[PDB]
Design an enzyme around this catalytic site. Structure first.
Site, mmCIF file in Angstrom:
data_model
loop_
_atom_site.group_PDB
_atom_site.id
_atom_site.type_symbol
_atom_site.label_atom_id
_atom_site.label_comp_id
_atom_site.label_asym_id
_atom_site.label_seq_id
_atom_site.Cartn_x
_atom_site.Cartn_y
_atom_site.Cartn_z
ATOM 1 N N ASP A 80 0.401 8.304 -5.063
ATOM 2 C CA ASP A 80 -0.030 6.928 -5.439
ATOM 3 C C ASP A 80 0.106 6.690 -6.946
ATOM 4 O OD1 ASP A 80 -1.265 4.523 -4.733
ATOM 5 O OD2 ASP A 80 -3.271 5.260 -4.712
ATOM 6 N N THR A 81 1.140 5.923 -7.310
ATOM 7 C CA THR A 81 1.369 5.474 -8.737
ATOM 8 C C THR A 81 0.241 4.470 -9.240
ATOM 9 O OG1 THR A 81 3.014 3.702 -8.546
ATOM 10 C CG2 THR A 81 3.924 5.871 -8.464
ATOM 11 N N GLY A 82 -0.683 4.169 -8.348
ATOM 12 C CA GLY A 82 -1.733 3.213 -8.644
ATOM 13 C C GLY A 82 -3.001 3.939 -9.005
#
Lengths: 99, 99
Positions: B25-27
């Site tokens: 997850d790049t978030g």
């Protein structure tokens, strides 16, 4: 282009001529966006988060212009702290996770 | 490898022996998990997202084995629904998010 996962991967966008600065969340199914007026062609929706569930509004086939491409895709409007684009817009753009 | 986002980028990683199917997850900033007995050497962190805030027990210097890569990392513990791999260990494995 490439995004090093050092700095957060934010991008400025246009969600139908309206300027919004966005996060590329790959842990996101969808894309969310507080502070915009899409239309009246929404759908009452619930999306879960890391601290729980919310309600968004779901507007299909929205013109969106980020990273020098145009995409028409499915934007939810609810109270997201940060506007996130999901795996839904990442694949329109034609991004991946290169190891 | 490579990850395309028509499917969520889930895979198995190892937290000192214990596998946990995780989401890349790049978030996420930090790597949050549930169902892992790590230690009684932690600092209770709190992190927010969509739906607000959970409280975590951040652990530091924590070897991980994911996608044939072996690393030491910080991950938290808390009531995260899915196991999330934030960027913290996205830059350990040394990932990029490419167009």
């Amino acid at each position: 282009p490439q995004f090093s996962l050092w700095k957060r991967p934010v991008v400025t966008a246009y969600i139908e001529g309206q300027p919004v600065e966005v996060l590329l969340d790959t842990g996101a199914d969808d894309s969310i966006v507080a502070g915009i007026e899409l239309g009246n062609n929404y759908s009452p929706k619930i999306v879960g988060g890391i601290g729980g569930f919310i309600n968004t509004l779901e507007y299909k086939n929205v013109e969106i212009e980020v990273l020098n491409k145009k995409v028409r895709a499915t934007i939810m409007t609810g109270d997201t702290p940060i506007n996130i684009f999901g795996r839904n817009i990442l694949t329109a753009l034609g991004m991946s996770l290169n190891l």
